[PDB]
């Protein structure tokens, strides 16, 4: 029941969601600073201007990580702190923050995992076309080269992108996230440039070859189950799996786009230059997996022939179905289809309505139950042949949940956003025990 000796138990955050200090120390505007100034885009008119004030309070947060016994901590780097503007010059204050963070993690025997892109693109890159422009892949490789030259052999695990599917769908299909475009026909072009950027960043990492360091990419998935045993539902579920879950894995591992992807974006081949699929599919050291919930699908007569069916219970405060077997099935499916490559679960967690009691304690037994089921499913996957190397709870801290603002709390540590006081929730106390036992009770 114990996990393997050396298994990496961690927790995760991202830069826009926790840092604040949005206009301090020379930091440039990101697309999410601009996006959050748009009236109507964010619940309650919330922004990441202050968030958890972690840029200033990072030493308090380092000590909370040490109190839990974390073996590793996943954060993202704010590109706009590093290259604030179109001169491309490096901001040394911004780079120094991440150096001090990484030095503090090592001082406490916590292994850094850094995500280079967790959605907060600098507005200057957006001004030069953002992910619609092929040239943004070269900007992202230059940013990667600067960070890996500066910190490579101090950060043993690097991730290029976080959730490129969400950037495509939310950022360009639906306009729900920055930069707010609403043109489904752009998705393939954007997906290709996100992939190309990962490939070019990976080439820059291999050329630097930092000692003891590894690089991968983080993808999110929703395990697909048909609503019935009927052939049409089974077919719709297979088609939805290929698109929803394999749009990025198929080119990353096999160097081709799948048929569901090419049908969805018929103009995709126009963006593919002769060396691009080889660049995109060069070998990664590990895959980061983000998982929260499955999707349940049925066939429809209306295009596009697929309907996602909503589930009313059991759900989190996001309305996301709780089904830990979806994590087991996702991990086994990736491993059988694409081979036994190293995997880290780089996000898994849940939002519930947390409230301090009269005594000031935050007891979140539903969140405990979510982790108990999901960590158990991940252990079964590992026993059944998945090369699972670590698990990162989303999130270390309650934080800015994008268009939901501060209405949704995913932390194992409660944050009072008025006073910045942090309180370990029951789930953090429980997870400390899991880490110390190297497994469930």
Burial 145-156 (b: 16+ CB within 10 A, else e): bbbbebbbebbb
Dist. CA 294–CA 311, nearest whole Å: 10
Distance between alpha carbon 285 and the CA centroid of its chain, in Å? 17
Residue 148's alpha-carbon distances to 154, 316, 361, 362, in angstroms, are 9, 38, 41, 39
Tokens of 285: 């050291």
Max CA pair span of the chain: 64
User: Nearest Cα to 80, choosing from 35, 43, 42, 40?
Assistant: 35
- How far apart are the C-alpha atoms of 54 and 166, rounded to whole Å? 25
* CATH fold group of domain 1-441: TIM Barrel (3.20.20)
274 contacts: CB under 8 Å, gap ≥ 6: none
Q: Where are the beta strands (DSSP E) in 83-163?
A: 111-117, 157-162
Cis check: omega of the bond before 395, within 30 degrees of 0: yes
Separation of alpha carbons 244 and 223, rounded Å: 9
d(CA 104, CA 62) in angstroms, rounded, equals: 7
Chain length of the chain: 441
| Burial of 12 (C-beta count, 10 Å sphere; 0-12/13-18/19+) | buried
Tokens of 24: 């301090």
Neighbours of 382 (CB within 10 A): 18
Tell me which H or E stretch contains 186.
none
Return the closest-CA partner of residue 401 out of 52, 31, 131, 84.
Answer: 52
- Gap between the Cα atoms of 418 and 109, Å rounded: 31
Sequence-ordered list of residues with C-beta below 8 angstroms from that of 386, at least 6 positions apart, any chain:
331, 332, 334, 335, 340, 343
3-state percent breakdown (helix, strand, coil) of the chain, nearest 5: 45, 15, 40
Q: Within 10 A of 87 (CB to CB), how many other CB atoms are there?
A: 8
Residue 302 in tokens: 């209306």
* Of 374, 366, 367, 312, the residue nearest 345 (C-alpha): 374
Report whether 377 contacts 328 (CB < 8 A).
Answer: yes
Residue 50, φ and ψ in degrees, nearest 5: -115, -45
Domain assignments of the chain as residue spans, ordered by start: 1-441
Determine contact, residues 20/48, Cβ cutoff 8 Å: yes
Stated as kind and residue range, the H or E segment containing 220 is strand 214-221
Instruction: Note every long-range contact of 331-337, with CB atoms under 8 Å and residues 24 or more positions apart, other chains counting.
Output: 331/289, 331/378, 331/381, 331/386, 331/388, 332/381, 332/384, 332/385, 332/386, 333/223, 333/245, 334/221, 334/249, 334/287, 334/289, 334/386, 335/381, 335/385, 335/386, 335/387, 337/246, 337/249
Euclidean distance between CA atoms 48 and 81, whole angstroms? 14
Whether omega before 164 lies within 30 degrees of 0, making that bond cis, reads no
Answer for the pair 357, 415: CB distance below 8 angstroms, yes or no.
Answer: no
Please give the Cα distance from 136 to 81 (Å, whole number): 17
- Selection from 146, 115, 374 nearest residue 219 by Cα: 115
CB proximity list for 105: less than 8 A, separation 6 or greater: 62, 65, 73, 111, 112
Instruction: Give the DSSP H/E element, type plus range, for residue 291.
Output: strand 286-291
Residue with tokens 């999130």: 395
In the numeric block, the tokens 């942090």 are attached to: 422
Burial (0-12, 13-18, 19+ Cβ within 10 Å), 426: middle
User: What are the Cα distances from residue 193, in Å, to 89, 152, 217, 251?
Assistant: 23, 24, 14, 12
8 Å CB contact between 326 and 268: no
Q: Which residues are designated catalytic?
A: 163, 347
The experimental method behind these coordinates is: X-ray
CB neighbours (10 Å) of residue 166? 17
Return the sign of the alpha-carbon dihedral for residues 224, 230, 236, 238: positive
Quote the CA–CA distance of 157 and 30 in Å, as a whole number: 25
Distance CA 71, CA 287 (A): 19
Q: How far apart are the first and last CA of the chain?
A: 9
């Amino acid at each position: 029941k114990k996990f393997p000796e050396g298994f990496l138990w961690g927790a995760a955050t991202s830069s826009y969601q926790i840092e604040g200090a949005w206009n301090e120390d020379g930091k440039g505007e990101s697309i999410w600073d601009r996006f959050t100034r748009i009236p109507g885009k964010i619940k309650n008119g919330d922004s990441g201007d202050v968030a958890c004030d972690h840029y200033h309070r990072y030493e308090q947060d380092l000590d909370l990580m040490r109190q839990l016994g974390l073996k590793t901590y996943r954060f993202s780097i704010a590109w706009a702190r590093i290259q604030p503007d179109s001169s491309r010059q490096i901001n040394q204050r911004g780079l120094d923050f991440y150096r001090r963070l990484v030095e503090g993690l090592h001082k406490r025997d916590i292994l850094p995992m850094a995500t280079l892109y967790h959605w907060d693109l600098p507005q200057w890159v957006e001004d030069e076309g953002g992910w619609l422009s092929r040239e943004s892949a070269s900007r992202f490789a230059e940013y990667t080269h600067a960070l890996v030259a500066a910190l490579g052999d101090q950060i043993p695990l690097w991730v290029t992108h976080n959730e490129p599917m969400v950037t495509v769908w939310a950022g360009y299909h639906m306009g729900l996230f920055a930069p707010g475009l609403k043109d489904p026909t752009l998705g393939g072009r954007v997906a290709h440039h996100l992939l190309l950027s990962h490939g070019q960043a990976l080439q820059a990492f291999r050329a630097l070859s930092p000692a003891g360091s590894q690089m991968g990419i983080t993808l999110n998935f929703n395990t697909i189950y048909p609503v019935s045993a009927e052939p049409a539902d089974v077919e719709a579920a297979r088609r939805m799996h290929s698109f929803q879950n394999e749009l990025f894995l198929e080119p990353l591992i096999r160097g081709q786009y799948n048929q569901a992807t090419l049908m969805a974006y018929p103009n995709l081949p126009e963006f593919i230059a002769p060396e691009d699929m080889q660049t995109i599919s060069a070998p990664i050291d590990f895959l980061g997996v983000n998982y929260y919930n499955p999707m349940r699908v049925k066939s429809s007569p209306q295009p596009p022939g697929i309907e996602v069916v909503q589930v009313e219970s059991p759900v989190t405060a996001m309305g996301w179905e709780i089904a830990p077997e979806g994590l087991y099935d996702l991990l086994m499916g990736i491993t059988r289809t694409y081979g036994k490559l190293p995997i880290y679960i780089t996000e898994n967690g849940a939002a519930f309505d947390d409230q301090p009691d009269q005594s000031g304690q935050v007891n979140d037994p539903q969140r405990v139950g979510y982790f108990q089921g999901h960590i158990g499913a991940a252990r079964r996957a590992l026993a059944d042949g998945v090369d699972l190397r670590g698990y990162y709870a989303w999130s270390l801290l309650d934080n800015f949940e994008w268009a939901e603002g501060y209405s949704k709390r995913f932390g194992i540590i409660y944050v009072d956003f008025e006073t910045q006081q942090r309180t370990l929730k029951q789930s953090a106390q429980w997870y400390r025990d899991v880490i110390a036992n190297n497994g469930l009770e």
